[model samples]
Target: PKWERTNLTYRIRNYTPQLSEAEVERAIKDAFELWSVASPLIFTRISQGEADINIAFYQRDHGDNSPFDGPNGILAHAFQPGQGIGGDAHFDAEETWTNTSANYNLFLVAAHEFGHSLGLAHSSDPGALMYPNYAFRETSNYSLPQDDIDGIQAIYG
Candidate 1:
């Protein structure tokens, strides 16, 4: 299901050591913006208390039944919209989360996970951000792909 509210809140419960606090925040903020720019949704960062979306970085079995494989198998996971864990996004700390192409790009992957957090499923369109596979797109001047724009707009436009 989709979030009924236009104004959404998120909290980064923890940060990945791969990047500095500022870098991680930038990635997460931009990730949410990828959808925000295409819809009526507005995302705000909350420092404490419960938020609509909660973000964290974990390794192996982070208590979630979906245990991540070492290094590369599963980069991250997120829940569909609802309450509590419903919109939480988890990252596998075992992988090297980076803003560069040498390792998994946090911005791209976080952008994809945020899609799930927003209730959009995997898109069949390979170029879509919601596509199941991890593909690296130039982050220097990134914009949401057309397929992704169409998908989010369909839900939140």
Candidate 2:
């Protein structure tokens, strides 16, 4: 259920028109760094071929059994570690994904989805990043909560 290796590679399968490629890359990198800094895990971005984690934006019924319910319902979804769809994170393209507090911040949402992709379930702590609900925070100095750090370390530390 956990990545057997510390170094993991991810591919941005598709880009959302809302943000530039550079912005999206930065957000995804920052999101993964939230876990990397806490645990021994390392994430690398791959521009080609298969990657342990494949990230993309999908509107609704994007092939996966779970279908996004439009804008505010499900912001995103992710699979646990394994083969094929496992470790892939899907964003609901119907919602406006952004790098600011205006909408669902890509960094925060990606960070949360990555937690699920890495095999961690929702945390009971409301303030935790792994909490089921999405909340906006200032990305200028965003830091992973100790609850999330402890959770990732327990599995990957």
Candidate 3:
């Protein structure tokens, strides 16, 4: 139901040609900090092997039982907390990921998928960060809605 532990580790196996490594790091780090900033959860990024969250870019059938569609359909996906496949977040290489007003912002998509990596499912609240179609907020001071805050806090508090 929840990660029984709060300390989580992650790794970015590869990068999207769309953005530089620093940009990717910023997006992912900022997204993860959305949780670490407001909750007791702590996340570390390892250089290689075995992390609570392992991220990568994949296309079509990347062999996870969940194949992705081209571009806008399913931008990315992630597993919940556990061993192995669990907590792994994969992005569709077919999409152009950016931190700006691009089609699917990597930061936004990662924020949503990592909610799954933290053991959260799609919330009935459409304004939640867990779902894809939530209205965009000012990027300068992005904040996860109360539903998202409440969801993780309920687990990690």
Candidate 4:
């Protein structure tokens, strides 16, 4: 089902050791806020129990049939809003998940995954943050690509 709810919640059940736990949390917070800044939607974090969006790190055959490849391949993905796995996001622990300034920046990747979490899909624009593949970008004050802003606005507006 298409998502209409403007408020959503998320949680990181575990963290990848590749970076400090703070980095993982930071990237996630930034990703969620990216949507908040562009739309009426709100993404709250749940510290305990299950969440509207459950996030975790996984490797090949982790579960849900969408296994991740080794380092630098198919970074991560999120489920569309609905039920169970819906709205959940899985990251590949096989890769080095780092801060916004490093290679395979978790901030950019999480931002893209949350596009799916917030009900958007991949865009054809290679420069778009929501492009299908991971593309390291400047993370400080990271800006959502126009294609991404337009994509979300198309849904939430």
Tell me the tens digit of each residue's lDDT in model 3 across 1-157: 5677778899999999999999999899999999887788899989887887899999999989899998778888888788888889999999988778757688888888889898788888887887656345556778888999998887887
Q: What lDDT would each prediction earn against the true structure?
A: 0.92, 0.92, 0.85, 0.85
Per-candidate TM equals: 0.97, 0.97, 0.94, 0.94
Clashes of each: 0, 0, 0, 0
| RMSD score of candidate 4 (Å) | 1.3
lDDT of 4 at 138: 78
lDDT score for candidate 2 against the true structure: 0.92
Per-residue lDDT of model 1, residues 45-114, tens digit only: 9999899999999988888799888889889999999987998999998999889987799999999999
Q: How many backbone clashes are present in model 3? A: 0
Question: CA shift at 86, candidate 2, in angstroms?
Answer: 0.8
Native-to-model Cα distance after best TM-score fit, residue 116 in candidate 4, in Å: 1.0
Residue-level lDDT of model 4, residues 1-157, one tens digit each, is 4576777788899999988888789888988898889999887898998788999998899869877888876888889989789989999889877774567788888888889988888899999988887777778877888998999888877
